[PDB]
Each structure stands twice: as C-alpha cells, then as structure tokens.
Design a binder for this molecule. Sequence first.
Ligand code: ICS
Ligand code: ICS
Ligand SMILES: [Fe+3]
Ligand SMILES: [Fe+3]
Lengths: 522, 522, 477, 477
Amino acid sequence: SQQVDKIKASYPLFLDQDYKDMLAKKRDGFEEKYPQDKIDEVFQWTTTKEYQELNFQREALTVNPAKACQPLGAVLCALGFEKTMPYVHGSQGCVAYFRSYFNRHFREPVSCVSDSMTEDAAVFGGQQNMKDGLQNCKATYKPDMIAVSTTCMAEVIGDDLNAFINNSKKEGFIPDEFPVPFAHTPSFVGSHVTGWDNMFEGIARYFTLKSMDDKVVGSNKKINIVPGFETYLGNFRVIKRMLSEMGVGYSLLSDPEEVLDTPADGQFRMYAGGTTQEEMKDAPNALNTVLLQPWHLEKTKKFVEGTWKHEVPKLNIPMGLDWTDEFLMKVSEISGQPIPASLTKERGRLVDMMTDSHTWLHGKRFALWGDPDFVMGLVKFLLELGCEPVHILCHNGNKRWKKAVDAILAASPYGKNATVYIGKDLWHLRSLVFTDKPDFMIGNSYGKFIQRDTLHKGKEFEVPLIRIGFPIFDRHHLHRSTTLGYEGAMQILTTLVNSILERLDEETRGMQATDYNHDLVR
Amino acid sequence: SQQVDKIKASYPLFLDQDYKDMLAKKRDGFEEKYPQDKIDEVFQWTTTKEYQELNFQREALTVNPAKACQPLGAVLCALGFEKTMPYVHGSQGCVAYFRSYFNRHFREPVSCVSDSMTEDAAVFGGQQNMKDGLQNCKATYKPDMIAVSTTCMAEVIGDDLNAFINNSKKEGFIPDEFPVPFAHTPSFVGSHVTGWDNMFEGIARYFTLKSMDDKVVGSNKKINIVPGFETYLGNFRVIKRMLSEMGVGYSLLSDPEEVLDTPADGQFRMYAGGTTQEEMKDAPNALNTVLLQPWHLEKTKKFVEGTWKHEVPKLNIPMGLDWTDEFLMKVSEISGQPIPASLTKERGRLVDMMTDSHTWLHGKRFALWGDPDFVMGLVKFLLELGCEPVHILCHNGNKRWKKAVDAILAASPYGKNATVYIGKDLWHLRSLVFTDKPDFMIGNSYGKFIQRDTLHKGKEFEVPLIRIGFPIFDRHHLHRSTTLGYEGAMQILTTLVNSILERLDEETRGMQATDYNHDLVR
Amino acid sequence: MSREEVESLIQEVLEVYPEKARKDRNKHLAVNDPAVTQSKKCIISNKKSQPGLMTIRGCAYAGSKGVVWGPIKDMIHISHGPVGCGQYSRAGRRNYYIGTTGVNAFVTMNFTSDFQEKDIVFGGDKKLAKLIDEVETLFPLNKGISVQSECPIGLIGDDIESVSKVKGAELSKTIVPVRCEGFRGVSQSLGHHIANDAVRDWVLGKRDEDTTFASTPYDVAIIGDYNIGGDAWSSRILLEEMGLRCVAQWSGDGSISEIELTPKVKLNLVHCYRSMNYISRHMEEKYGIPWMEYNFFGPTKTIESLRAIAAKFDESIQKKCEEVIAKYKPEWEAVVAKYRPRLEGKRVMLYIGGLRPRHVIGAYEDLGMEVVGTGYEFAHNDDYDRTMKEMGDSTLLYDDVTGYEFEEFVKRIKPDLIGSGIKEKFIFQKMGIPFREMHSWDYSGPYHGFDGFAIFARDMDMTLNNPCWKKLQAPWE
Amino acid sequence: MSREEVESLIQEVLEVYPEKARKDRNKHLAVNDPAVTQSKKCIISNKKSQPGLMTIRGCAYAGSKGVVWGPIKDMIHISHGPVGCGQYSRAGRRNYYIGTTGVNAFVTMNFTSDFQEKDIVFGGDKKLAKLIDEVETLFPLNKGISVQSECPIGLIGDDIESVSKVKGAELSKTIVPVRCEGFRGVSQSLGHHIANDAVRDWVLGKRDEDTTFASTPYDVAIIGDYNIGGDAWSSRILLEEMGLRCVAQWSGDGSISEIELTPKVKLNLVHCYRSMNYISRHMEEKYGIPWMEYNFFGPTKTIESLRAIAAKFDESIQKKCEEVIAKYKPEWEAVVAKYRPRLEGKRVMLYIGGLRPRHVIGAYEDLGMEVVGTGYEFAHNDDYDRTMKEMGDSTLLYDDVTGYEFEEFVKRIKPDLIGSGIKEKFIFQKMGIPFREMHSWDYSGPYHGFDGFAIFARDMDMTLNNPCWKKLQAPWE
Ligand code: ICS
Ligand code: ICS
Ligand SMILES: [Fe+3]
Ligand SMILES: [Fe+3]
C-alpha cells in the first residue's frame, strides 16, 4: 500500500510488513536457501587470515577488478581534440558501454561511434564497415577529425587499420585530406590508461611524423603538456591556471574539459573546446614536453623524445607539496619564467592548512587503490601529511612502478607499515582491510561494497570509504574537483581531515555513553 | 591501562571496563542521580508537542542562542582595513572571547586590543584607559589606523568615545593626524551584524563626512561594494573575481580576506591586505554603492544615501540563481559593462548541475538558521532547487525581514509548508525538528547537539546537520568555502545533494536487510 | 499530429545521410496508423545498425549476461574474456535481490577471467578450469556457475562447452556455458535468445524426474520480470493477494531452484515477451504449461491484467481478484486526483529497449498524458504489431534510432517529456527538455503495480514541473 | 644559559614601550634563580593589565562561570546579561562529564537572560524571576541554579541576591547568585575567588546538620580538577586503586550532591591550588579537614604524589600504593623507552593560566625535555614561589605577557616547542614553531596519570617531529 501524501520508493517501501512476509514466504518456499547460521559462518570465514591466504593464491580468477579496457582510455583521449569524433573500429556493444560508463561518471553527454562489425566481419574483416562508417560519421556529425581505436574483436581478427583507412580515402568514402589518426587498442593488453597512451601517440604521430623537416625545438617558446587519462576537470583547469600565473606559454594536448562541462542553456553542443589540429602540428616547435602522468605515458614519451627530440623531464605527477614544487621549478627552468608571488602564497596557504590539521591526520592508516600515477601521488601526499599508507593497490601497475613506490615509502618513517600490491583486485583488498584493518579507504565507488562488508562484520570493524578516483557513480559533481597542484592538495587535505572528524562525531554521538567526547571544538 | 603500540585518547579510553566500573561506582555512591527510567521519561516528554507549547511560551529565558554581541561584528569589520588594529573600549574579557571565537572559526591569528577598564573606570569612566591604550597600541603594534568599538561596560557607564579620543589627540597621546574612527556598539542591542554595521558606518563617516565638498558622484568610474559581516573567504574572492571578469572597476570596502588567510612561510604577518584609507576617502566619487547584505546594512545605507548621495540599488544578497542574475544585471546597468560570456557559461553550468541533481533534491524538507541575509538567500536557493524549507529560524531577524521572507515563500509552491521564526533560539528549533521532523538541518556547529538529541530518540528520528554558516568549529577549513554567486550556489548544491546521498547510503548499508537499495549508480 | 507534417519531417531528417544509409534508415521510420495490423508493411526492425551513426544498441553479452543471467542471485556468472565487459556491466542494472552478497548472492560482483595476450594466443580453456576450481574454493555456497563469453572467446578457438561439461561432472555442479559473444546478432535480443537456450539446455530440466515438490492448482511463475527497483516484488504481492502461489520469478531476485521448479507450475505469466518468449513457448510445448502476457503499468492495465489472470482460474480466485481491486481502488484514485491535473495534456516521447516503449503508455494515459512518439532499440515486428494498436494516429515510430535522428525529431515535435536511457538523458537536459530514465527508473521505482503507480506519478510530476527547466535562458540574453 | 644575555633580551624587548608601560612591564619579566624562593623580590604578578597591549587574560566571569561553576553538570548556570558572554563560553572548555544533556545535565548548554535595552534601563530582576520559573518548568530534573553576572548586572544595580533568596525559598531550590561581573578584578583569578565564595555561602554547608552519610577513614575529595579531556577520571582511577574512596570531585564531572558531601571526607586533594585554595582553606578551618597539593603530570610526579598521599593513611593504603606503582611501572617505562629518544634535548616554552606552567614541567623532563621559559596569565606570587625552584637557572619568567613580548622572546630563544592557548597557536605555527594547546590539550588527552602520560608523550612527539614543520621554506626561495 501507499499513502498519497508520503509516497515511499523501494527503500523503505519493501520494509513494510506485507512485503517482508511475502519475501519470507518466497525464500522459505522456493529458494532452497542455505540456513542463516551457515551464511553467518561462511561470511565470518571470508573475513579470516586463512581465507586471505586462499584468496591471494588466486591465479586464474579475477574478482571485482579495479581497471577497465584500453579503448575507454582511447575514447577519452580522442574527446580532448577539437571537433573530434571518437570512432571505435569493432563491435557496437563496447561503445554502448564506454558511453554509459563516462555518462555516469561525468553526468555529461559522451559522443562516440562504432562501425558495428558483426559475425560477417569475423570472416571477411571489417574493411567495408570502416569505409561506410567513416563516410556516415563524417556526413552526419560533421567532425573536423575522426580518431580511430579498436575493440578486441577487431584486434583478434587482425584488422589492418592503416590499410582500411587508406583504402577508404582512395575510394572516395572520405576526402584524402581529412585527418583520420588511428591506434591499435587491444583490450587484452594493459588497461584504459594504456589505451589513452596508444591513442595519443597515434594522433601525435599522424600530425607530426612526416613534417619534422622544418621543425625547430623551442621556436614557438611554449611547453607542451600531456595530461594522460584524467577524469577530474579541476586538474586540467589548475594546470592551465598555474601556467598562466607564471606567464608560461603552453599547449595542453588532449584537453577535454570544455566538451565534458558544457552549459545547459537550451542547445546541445556535441563538440566544444579541445586541442586544435594547429596546436598538434606545431607541438614539435615547443621548448619541451611535460608528461603529467609518466607511468602510463611511456609510448608517448618514446615518440616525443625520439621524433620531436624533446628532452622530456623526469617529473612525478604534480600531486602534493614536494611534487608540485618540483613541477613548478622544472617549468621555471625550461621557460625561464620565475615562480610568481601568487603561487608562493598559495603554497604557504597549503602549508598553513597542513600545520592546522596535522594533529588529526597523524598516524591515520589508509588503504588506497587506483591508477599508478594517481596512486603514487596520493601515497606521497599521505606521507607528507604524516599519514600511514598500509594497503597500496594498483591493479594495472607493474614491477618498475612498484619498485618506485617502495623507494618512496622507504624515504619516510610513515611508510614502514605499507605494502604495495600490483595485479590484485578489490576482493584481495577486501581481505586485506579485514585482516589488517586501516582507518579509511581512498578509492572509487567500487569501495562502497567493501565498506558494506566490513560493517556487516560489525560497527567496530567498518572501514569508511573516501571517494577519490575514477569512476565515482554514487555521488554528484565530484568530477569537478581538483587533485593536482596546491589547490588539489588543499581539497584532498580538507576531504581527509573532515572525513576523520565526521567519523569521530559519529562514534561519539551516543548520549550518556560516548558523548563525553562529542566536542563542539575540534 | 595503555598499550604502547595502540594508545587510546579519552575516546575510547574511558570505555574500558575499569573506567566504566569506576564511573558506575561514582554515580551510584555520590551523585544522587535521578533513576534512568525518570531520565528516559523526561527526555521523551521534551520531544513532545505539549513540551513544544511550553517551550514557545518562553518570555524571559533564552536557551542556546544563535547570535552573538555587537563588538564581535565591529572587530570583524575593523579587520578589513589596511594595517588597522581593532580596539575595543571596555573590559578585556570580551576581547579574549572575540579572539578565541574567531580563532576557532578561521584557524588563524586574530589581532584585537582592549583598554582593560576595571571597577575604577566603573566609578570614574575610562578616559585614562583610552589615552594610555591608544598610545600603547600605536607604539607597540604600529598600526596605520585604530578602529574603536565598545563593550557593554563602557556603554552602560556612558563613555563619550568622541570626547575621549579628541582629548587623547590634544594631550599628545596620539598624533592629531592619526585616524581613529569609533562606533558605539552596545551588546544589549541587535547582534554581531549590527556591530559590523555600526563600525563600518563609523569608519565611513570618519573618512568622508567632512570632505564632501569636492566629491563628484561617478567621477572615479567605480562601484563600491560593502560585504557586511562575512565569514567565508570564498565570498570576498568570488565577488572580486566576478567583477574583474566583467571589467567593472570596484572598491571592496572592508576586505579582511588577506589578513584571515596569511601563508605559513616562517613569519607572522599581523596585518595583510585590507581596504586602504585612500579607497575610503575616494569612495564618495564612485558611481554607486552596492550592499551585499542589506538586511544588516541599514545604518550604512542611510549614511551612504544621505551623505554620499549614491542611489543604493534595492538588491538581495547575491545567492542562488535569480539573485545572482539580478546582481550581475544591476552591476551591468550601473557600470555600462556587458555581462561577459564566461559568466554566462558559469551560469549555464550551475543550471546543468541543477538539472542533474533535481531528482534527489526535490521535496526534501529542511530546517535552517543563521543571519537574516544568509538565511533568506539560502531559502531562495532552496526554493529554486525544488526543496521545501520547513523551519526557518533567525534569532536576530525582525518583523520586516520576516515579511520579506514570507513574500519569498508565497511566490513558490515549495514554500507552502514553511514557517519563519524570529527571536527564537536553538532550543525552540530542537522542539520543532522533533514535532515536525525535517530531512536535514542547515546551520552552524551548534546544530550538532540537536542531531545528538534526535538520534537519542532513535535512528528513524535523527536529523543530520549540514554545516553552512557561522561559526563552524568542528570541521576544518570550511571557512574557505563560497556561498555567493554561481560558484557558491554550485558548492551548496554539491554539499546538499551529497549529504542526501550519503544519508541514503547509510540507511541502505545493512546486508540482506536494506542493501537491496545500496545502488552503485545514483 | 498532422501526418503529412510528420512524413515531411522524416524526409528532411533523412536528407543528411549518404544514399545507402538514407535508404536503410528510411525503412526504420514510419508514421503510425492504429488500423494497420501487419507492421512489416510499414516499419522494419531487428536489422543490423548502420556503421558510424551512433546507435543506442548494446551487444548479445549485454542481453545475456546483463539481462537474463546476471540477476540470478545464487549463481556466479563469469565474464569470460578481457576485463572491460564485466566491469562496465557491474551493478549497472538495478535488478534487485535479497541476499548476502559475496557469501550466498553474487549479482553485483564482477567475476572475470581477465584475458591477457597469452590467453588470446594459447587459448583460455585451462585458465577457465583453474578459475572454476578457484570459484569453488572461494565461494562454497554458490549454487551454480555460468560462463558468459565475450567477443574473443568466439573469435579464438576456445571450447567452453567441454570445459563446463567436464568440470560440472567432476564437481557435481551446474556449469552453464553461454556463447553470448558480443559480435553475434545485432543487439541485445540475440543475447536474450542465446541465454534462454542456455537456460533450457542446462538448468530448466534438472528436476524432470523429481516429483517431490508439492503443487497446487494456483501455481504460477513470473517470467521476464527483472525486478528493476523492486518491480517484480510489487507485482508478486498483488498476485499472491489474489490467492495465487508464485513458485518462481525469472530472473530478477531469481534463484536457480526457482528456475528448476518452474516446469511444475500451472500458468506462466510473461511480463517481457521480447526476452522470455523463447522459454515460454518451449515450456508450453514440452510441459504443456500455458502462458499469457500481462501489464502492471498503471491502474487500468493492472486491473485488466488481474481480471484476465483471475479468469484463467476458478471462481474463488476471481472473487479474490475483485477484492484486491476494491482494496486498492482508493489508493490509485487518490494518486490520479493529485497528479493528473499537473500532467494533463503533456506530451511524451519514448525510446527504450524491447518492451517498455509500448508497455508504459497506459500509465501515461492514466495521468492524462499523450505519447506522441515511441520506438525500440531491438524490438521485432511482432512488438511493433502490438505497439501500433497501442499508439495513436499520426504518431512517429522509430526503430534503432540514431542520435542525430532522435535529436532532430525531438527538436521538431518538442514534447514536454522524454523517456529514454542514460546516453540520451544529458543531451535532452541540455536541450532544456525534462527527461526520465525509463530503463533504471532514474534510480527510483518500482513502477509496476498499484504501489509502483504512485511512485511513477510522483516522479513524472517532479521532473516535468521542476523549476530548473524555466531557468535555461539567462535574463540578459 | 647566559643570564646576562636573557636580561639584555628583556631590555631590548622593553625598549619599544612608552615610558609608563615599559616601567610597568619591567616588573613582570625576570630571569630565574632557583635559590631565590621569595619571588616578590624578583617578579610581580596579579596586577592590572596595561591598556592596548594585547594581553591574554580573560575576566572574572570566565574564572567563575567558565572555570568553577560551569562544569557542575546537574545544575543550570544562567549567563545573566547580554548575549555575548555565554555564547563565546558555550562548550569552549572540555570539562568532561557523564550525563543526558538537556535532561539531567546542562554543561554544554547556554542559558542566558539575553539582555535587551529595556532590561538595561528598567532593570532585570523581574526578568530573572520569570526566567527562573521558566527554567523550573522546562528542566524539571535540574538540581539547582546558579546566576553568573555579566558586566551590566553590576553596573545597573540589579539585586540578584534578593531574587535568588526569594525564588529559592519559593521553589525549595538552591539558587546561587554569583557576582562575577567581568570588570571586577584583573583576570580570571578573582572569578575563582568569587565562585569559591558562592560555593561556601550557598552550597557547601547544606548538609551540616545531616549525619546520614556513611563515612570511612579512606574518604577523599578531588578539589580543583576540571576533568579536561577526562583528566580527573584518569586520576580518580589511580586513587581508587590505592584503596581510597573519592567521595567528591570538584568541579569537573561534579554534581551538587558531591559538593554537599565534601565536608564529610578525611582529606582534600587539591590539584589546582590557584583556583580552589580558598575553599580548601575554608574547609580546613570550618571542618578540620586537612588538604594537600598533588601532581599527576608524568610518572615521576605521579609516583611521588601517590606515595605522599598514601603516607597520610595507614599501612594497608601504603601497601596498595606500592602495588599500584609496581603495576603501572612497565606501561610508563615502555612509553619512556619509545618516546624519550624522539624528544631528548628539545626545549620548550610555556605560557598558560595559573597552575599548569609549573605542573607540566616534570612530565616534560620525564621525556628528556627542558623548559627554557614559562609564565602565567593570572598567577599570584605564591605560584611563582612554587615555580622558581622547579625551573632551571637563568630561564625566562614572564607574568601577563603581551603578544608582542612573547613573540619577541620566542624569536630570540627559538624553542623547539611552545605550549599555550588558542590565541597564540596559529601565531607560532605561522612562525614555523611546533605548538601544543596546553589548556584544551589540543582536543586530545587526558594527560593526568599513567594513562594520560602515554597520550602526552604521543602528542608531543607527533607535533614536535611532524613533517609539516620542515616545509615552510619554498625550495625556490
Ligand atoms: S528484458 Fe530488455 S533495454 Fe525486456 S534488454 Fe533491456 S529490464 Fe529495457 S525495455 Mo534496459 S526488453 Fe527488460 C529491458 Fe525491456 S535492460 Fe531492461 S529497461 S523489459
Ligand atoms: S582552573 Fe585555571 S587558564 Fe587552575 S582558569 Fe584556566 S583547567 Fe589554565 S593553567 Mo585554561 S589556574 Fe585550570 C586553568 Fe589552570 S581554564 Fe584551565 S587550562 S588548572
Ligand atoms: Fe551534466
Ligand atoms: Fe590557519
């Protein structure tokens, strides 16, 4: 039943007595459910150290991974170029999924097309799909450029993207001068960040490889910035703002911030902003190229150093105090621009915030996961705050990255209880946060189920989730946040300390039991 | 006892069995405590409609007020002027309290001095205190200006600030040219916002009353901005940024944002930033004066219109969508500057966030309190979101303000269940949120005790607190936030929708009980 | 409205396409005439999508793993292949269930083989066998395993059928191989068909020889309700109030024992014909169980459905049906009285998957609303046969609509409300048109049944009449 | 060291003052000599503050309402006057208690008469009477009412004593008038004295004729512990483990019945001499109860204190004392072993109210730390008498230090750590010097007793050795 003045949705509607009785009847009569005592015993067992040993002996089974496939990264990279249509050569279900994933993270329209290869292309290839799809896409959505990636169907059958596109051009399906960069993005290799790297290298090669003769390093007095796979609009914005404050000429290559933040003013803008083709053509003339997320920009680094002849600086991701300092100093050295007083003051304000919340931050134990560069930047900032990373997980990390993170940890006393895991998933992490309980988790929305499980063990065992990373599906507008630079460090510090204080307030709220510590002033 | 490797603070140390037993022994043996059944019965009674009827019959007793005394506002206003020392004529305990209050809100040093009047001044006045204090303050802290307010001791004995300061100047304690504006700030009248108004009017009069002869309205091509009592640094910053984007020349009068946000770089800066004396002297030459918080800037309005001859626009506080629009349009009309495309895009982005979050915001019921302008701006924005303000409380509001808020409420269907209370305190509001339960509270840190009480009734009766306003003592760095303009509206929208979703996640976390609704995607 | 105007609009929209794409897309757009019964003569459906045109369709893996098999709570469903497919589909669909996740229910988890290059080159059958052993060790209370093939499985020479047979015989466990590779078919619909075939071949008949389950003349099964937001529960309560015993519901909040018990029921109640007609027809042939379509969207359809279902049984059930209708009448009448004045006259366009574009029209009409356009991603011609008599004259029909087409149609028709999926939502919100998600119910619901109707009406009012839609134009421009 | 260097620093700091201010402030700054036990010949204290110099001192009302009376949990304390005073002092001091706030405890609430202009002009006695009636109606479980006068009450000639007497007789309730107007005295200290007088006159002797309380030779009262962060509880557990019975606890977590029962104890244990010496001496004269000062800051002081207290009773208590000391020895020994190497050699400056600047020194020395400077807001000359012998030779002493003075002293001395209140914290954090709040324990604690010592050591280490302090200089500056 419903009351017209207070209508109830599924929660709490299904807690009504009639629904509870009906569900109990269903369970008892037809579900053949394991007895509740068995369920409790098995759950308790899944929280144990012996279960963790079994769980970490896994070799073939992956449970709740913390990564996606390459073409998602390729699509995100393609979205950062002006009037560019991401085009995925392969099956259309992949594109439906990529679009919905990005829709739910950004709450914004995401444009992407496929050439809808079917069983027929499994024996004849997808050349006809490519020709007709390029013609249809260009005619219908009027892009200035089509950036081609691949699904695993196309990769397994070995579709030659270069030959297909060249034949499409010769046969008049699309003009010969129409830019169609391409990249092979096999989903059984690496992850979404690798797909971003491959797509970016493809675009850069397409625009610069054959015209290097008239290129002179430093002639345009700019620094190229490659952000990598970035899902916080504030990060693009803060890099632009920081370079503008220094008076440093720059070229952000793959800038999707406008197309992912269009206003709601009565019209649908399929394209907005983005790196122009002229910027990509002129990039080799820059002073140097800075890679913001080097640990998944390796192929791009190889191309930029080998072909553009730029001496790409060895810089970490500009996260936290020290790495932001190092990034700014390297930019100052490259451009000859001094670091202005505004950035010095902003740095001092971040230090001020640190000195204030240090008493609440000190010694807090964290489990965290995400992409390699983001994870290592977060680890470095946590060590700067006097916090203890305990479980550091990166499903798509590698041995070299793990060694670098271990060297970061060894440089600080606060890294003594930390362990870095690569190739492990969120079921592994669930076991870890049961058997070596941290104070909090920092990760994406998939950590909410771990918080649910730890609460099921008991309130004293619950590990609250702090949502930083990608994807974030169960909160609104957090994609507007910043994690890079002093501003990002400030936002992260605020989030962390206020999560700590919110948990403390929750634990001390009980009247006449724990509220002796429910202080007004913290 | 303590374990050296896991040391416990008061919570949870005092939950140990030995401490529990000792406290039970203390209570049983020596406290003569009412039996727990009586305590439960009285609490339950305090949650009732009959108790609320008794509570709202109060005429002489105030419990948990939601306002402070005038000189606190006067000190905040004085802090906004360059190298200015707030000087409170009266008792030193008041200054200790003002400084601590602002320290805890801003987490920054707050400079303020007293002339330490004692019982001797109660008999013979505080003229000598004024002379010696002005001399000592100027000699020691080297201010460019001393802004004098009063505590209630000085007001009750009727100390003539004008005569005292003039006598100090003639007798050589301070130079005759040294600016010493003053204002009577009686704490038994109005509240802290009234003190801000009085101090600002005093400073403006001191700098402009006697030099009006050569003043020509509009000759400096600027608009004066008076922010009033403002405790969000983001608000000053957003007003400055928005006026700079429009290319509008402006003069922010009483700008304390620099002195309340100094960097931690190894030196203590007692003064920083602030409105200059030249700006105050030249203010009458502006095109017009805009008051950001008109409902406590009445005396300032009288002086600005009567003496400067500025036609002060009738504008609401620039909060929400419509009032930000109206503020920008009035500024455009006054300055002849068009509204630029950046502000149009920012407005469209706020509208986009509204459309993205409307399904979760719609129909949510709120109790809120704070200062009049802030409260009415929040009410207007909540009506724009499709939310239902239910209990609107302003302890320092008046009848005319209440009528204006009632007219705002009547203009929207979402205001039909709203009631505006003036002169009521947080004990009244506690009764209201028990007997007509809203979904959330929006207010300052004093609402946490109401959340505690509602939780004590039961989890189903708990009303979570959303901390917006002043003071905020139990979270860190929220004073950096913004509430004005499109940016402030965006921040508030994000806070509200994510508070809603966080509560929903909490209520649906129980495994096999309510987690059927623990959705990944919201 | 104004038929000739609508065909004009169809032609003007079509002009932008190249000739092959234009000729193809012309067959997929028709102006409705309720007199027409054979929809093949007007609109074409269930064809391949045009490359490069931004279709909304999914793949067969979505239709099988995402739709049919995934909701089965007490089984573990393995996404066999590279990491993407299981990750993008993890918990994206709100097929609600009661269980202890990770212990005895597994719906919102993502089990995958996470194919690497070596698994592509040297095959993945041995990895599959080891994975199944790992599943058994780590999730002992699971009641069966399904293997949902992604694209590379079909492309490379993997044979998951023999692995499933061998391992299932070795561990005495039901292991269901599903060849739902995403390149098969043209949409989610062949995914439905493949999944139904897997159910029939590996699960449905396990208890053909077992006769220990006690049956009654009032035994029914709910087929093709996936319990989005609790829809199936909100329908089941009405059915049981009518005096029927719901032995099984497929597949939302479904368990493998319920599937195995289905052949023992007296009547199959089919909600989604598109996805479960295959198994319903099979059950009628092999077990003699009749089936019927029903509709619990809005009070008129719900009342008609309850009366027809009760008519399939004795007089006592019919009396109970009249009692249920009488008991609920004031609730939906109060809903209508409160929300019809706020929605009367408003016009809606829809674009959804295989069933809901026609199934929800009755509820809109119960709120005095008109559906001026509807269409499907992957429906078949029988679905359009039902839709045309459901829809009014001169209304627009679109099959497998492209993003550009739907945008142009909306810009011309200018409906007051659009109901579609997540990939269209923000487009039309930017266009300033209220939008309700009609797949996930915008994380709201349930909408089925009398209790669902109140939520439906509240949601449509709160979105259609929201103040945000009046603020898209800045006062200065 | 270098006594001459410190005296020169005092002179150089003083030069900026005008002549009268400089001459006054010269008497309040001294270089320590432990052999000098007559501090009056060396430093002066408990004098008026110099106007305009930014003192740290509060006022009588803070010393009475904020310090002595406010912690009494089962009474309702009325801030009589305008709104500011009660609001700024509401829950600002962490005097912990067990109770049901708003029902039978009222510590963190703010009851006030909220004086308006008409109350200033026509007086406030009638408003006070009506307020007391309203309190009785709305908080029936309150066990007494105190009236804490703010400045205007003394200025307008209001007679709160007669109102309190009349209403208390009318309602058979204890109503305690306190004339703690903020203009009285020169600091919180006269607030302490006024509050103690109110306790003596209106509460302490209510049970002089009552002989129904059963007493033992081991009855003690804790006087002058306000239970900051639970300090008094962490001390009470040690006392009870020694075999004593703590009848009363003034005033943290205190109740009015405990105050009334205090005259029945055998020994008064005074923690804060400065605030409660008045009532302790009164109790000795009137009831013959001896009193003694103790110190539970750090293992050395607490061991000495436990032994001295046990020496006042028979041999069984002394045996229990040795057992308590033995039981706790490994805990504080482990704390010392862990944290002394991290803090050995570090130098601290302090500035606090009236007791702690000398009481915490032993705790600092137990971690191998030196107090190179200390001072008081409102101490008296007996306090400096006690302070000099505990501070090192040629250390700096400052009474009622101005903000400028303390900043200059810190700039010269450059201690490794400063302990003071909230108004100095961010000043010295911006100067890059670690700072611990020594009033509120930085929202940490307790620090008293063996359990408190571990928290103290962890706090000092976490702040002193925090990495933030090494980052104040930008690498490009
Ligand atoms: S199964 Fe089908 S697309 Fe019948 S694949 Fe799709 S939960 Fe739709 S119109 Mo999402 S044929 Fe169900 C459907 Fe309808 S996922 Fe749901 S809403 S009634
Ligand atoms: S009462 Fe006094 S200022 Fe003795 S007014 Fe003050 S809780 Fe201080 S040095 Mo705050 S004479 Fe207590 C004190 Fe000491 S408030 Fe506390 S820390 S031991
Ligand atoms: Fe959006
Ligand atoms: Fe600060």
